[PDB]
Amino acid sequence: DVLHPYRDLFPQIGQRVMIDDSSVVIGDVRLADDVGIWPLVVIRGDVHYVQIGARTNIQDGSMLHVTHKSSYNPDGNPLTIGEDVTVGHKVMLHGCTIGNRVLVGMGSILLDGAIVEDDVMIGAGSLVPQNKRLESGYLYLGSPVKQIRPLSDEEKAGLRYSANNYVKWKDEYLDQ
Amino acid sequence: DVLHPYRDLFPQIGQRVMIDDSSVVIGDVRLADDVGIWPLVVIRGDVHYVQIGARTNIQDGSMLHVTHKGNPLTIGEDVTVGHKVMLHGCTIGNRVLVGMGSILLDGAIVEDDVMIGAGSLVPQNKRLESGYLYLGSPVKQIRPLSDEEKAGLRYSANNYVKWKDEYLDQ
Amino acid sequence: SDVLHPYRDLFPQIGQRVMIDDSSVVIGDVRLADDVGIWPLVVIRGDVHYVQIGARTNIQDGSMLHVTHKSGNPLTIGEDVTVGHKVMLHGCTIGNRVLVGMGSILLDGAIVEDDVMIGAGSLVPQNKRLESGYLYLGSPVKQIRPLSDEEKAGLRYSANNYVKWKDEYLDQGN
Ligand SMILES: [Zn+2]
Ligand SMILES: [Zn+2]
Ligand SMILES: [Zn+2]
Incomplete structure (x- = not known):
């Protein structure tokens, strides 16, 4: 179906979690309560784990992976996502770390070692870039991204609103 | 199966429409005649509707959605939507070619006879003048299209129409 | 399980120890050499022309592979090649031991030589040739510098790792 194992590892699911039947979730993947996985999304926590916080939404076509523990990279790079996170359509998340209340614009690519602090918006x-740290409370845009400006109080609030909205849209589908 | 409902909203399909079994169409998605939806595509018309004109092709890997809660998705006729294209709450005219891998944001407006590399x-709310070539991230007006190119736009839609009718048969 | 689809009279040619995720779509004249690994939600369409993928090459999750439209040109990928997540390949040619960085887009007629790294x-861009032994980065790409010996070695290690990971999935299945 949608949940697949890797070695002895199997996805750990929380409450009110949605995972579209067209998506794929493999290995050591942890989905906290109210996490919603939309259509044609792949989350592969095989060579390392993938931890996703509560009320976080992974939008259509997103791709999540990690990097294996190697010689110069003994720790490898697991994927960690906080809560109230909005991951846009076709986003590429790879072995990075995302705090809480963050919005990753659709089509973005976050590489290994990147760290996104809380209350951050990405165009x-x-x-x-790898090992790139995004300072809390700002808006970043570009390829490679550049710090554009601080977020308005409205935009910060929008971060929470965005997550909630998706939690709701998630529930509407579970209700069908 | 391939057509999913969003409460009381269900996709409306015209004539000779092609939808791959691997793609997901949800909610108020309106597909005119000869529209061809290709492999692994997702079209979500929940919070708002999605309307796609006649003889339009949505190639492999595209993702179509609307403006989150404020703007429906509207695509004209003879429109060629390249592979893995991201269309979000925008408005596309007739005879438009959206280069594979492109991203069109909320409120964007593409007039007729335009080519996107x-x-x-x-970007959001950006308008592209008809008869021009736009390329870049963010796009820039490169130059005007030749009559030859403006013609090639219609021929692309035509070719893909035959292309989808072929999959429908053999 | 129905990942293999035909197109007219053309049908996929599969080699040895080849993995194709059940969520992926392979259509028409697609040829997969030994140890090739097709990961989740990938689409490979060899209808108006064929697709050839050399041995020990990996095509990562969400990638989109197609050939040139009539107006063609087949898609050819060498051996020990590493195609990154969500990569788009279109009517191009990739030599041996090449790593295509995730999210990248390779257009029609592009020719990538052996031992190359793409960020x-x-x-x-169309018909662009990537010279052997260099790192290319950007949109559109620019030749940055020669790959070091370690980097070149890295190309082989990458293909090797994905061949193993692929077999682990083949193991869990069978
Ligand atoms: Zn990866
Ligand atoms: Zn959306
Ligand atoms: Zn194509």
Whole structure:
């Protein structure tokens, strides 16, 4: 179906979690409560784990992976996502770390080692370089991304609103 | 199966429409005649509707959605939507070619007879003048299209129409 | 399980120890050499022309592979090649031991020579030739510098790792 194993590892699911039947979730993947996985999304936590916080939405066509533990990269790079996170359509997340209340614009690519602090907004089609740290409360855009400006109080609030909205849209589908 | 409902909203399909079994069409999605939806495509018309004109092709990997809660998705006729194209709450005229891998954001407006180079990013609320070539991330007006090119736009739609009628048969 | 689809009279040619995720779509004249690994939600369409993928080459999750439209040109990928996540390949040619950075787009007629590295999210324009032994980055790509010996070695290690990971999935299945 949608949940697949890798070695002895199997996805750990929370409450009210949605995972479209057209998506694929493999290995050590943890989905906290109210997480919604939309259509044609792939989350492969095989060579390392993928942890996703509560009320976080992974939108249509997104792709999530990690990097294996190697010689110069003994720790490898697992994928960690906080709560109230909005991951846009066709986003590419790879071995990075995302705090809480963050919005990753559709079409963006976040590479290994990148760290996105809380209350951050990333413009669509952006590219976040490896080991790039995004300072909290700002808006970044571009390929490679550049810090554009602080977020308005409205925009910060929008981060929470965005997540909630998706939690709701998620529930409407579970209700069908 | 391939057509999913969003409460009381269900896709409306015209004549000779092609939808791959691997693609997902949800909610108020309106497909005119000869529209061809290709492999692994997702079209979501929940919070708002999605309307796609006649003889339009949505190639492999595209993702079509509307403006989150504020703007429906409208695509004209003879429109060629390249592979892995991202269209979000925008408005596309007739005889338009959206280069594969492009991203068109909320409120963007593409007039008729326009060509968008592959891998482009059309920012939010941006309008593209008819008869021009736009390329880049964010796109820039490159130059005007020759009559020959403006013609090639219609021929692309035509070719893909035959292309989808072929999959429908053999 | 129905990943293999035909197109007219053309049908996929599969080699040895080849993996194709059940969520992926392979259509028409697609030829997969030994140890090739087709990952989740990938689409490979060899209808108006064929697709040839050399041995030990990996096509990562969400990639889109197609050939040139009539107006063609087949898609040819060498051996020990590493095609990154969500990469778009279209009527181009890739030599042996090449790593295509995730999110990149390679257009019609592009020719990538052996031992090459393309940065993530790059765009290779039509008929563009990528010279052997270099790193290319950007949209559109620019020749940055020669790959070091370690980097070249890295190309082989990458293909090797994906061949193993592929077999682990083949193991869990069978
Ligand atoms: Zn990866
Ligand atoms: Zn959307
Ligand atoms: Zn194509």
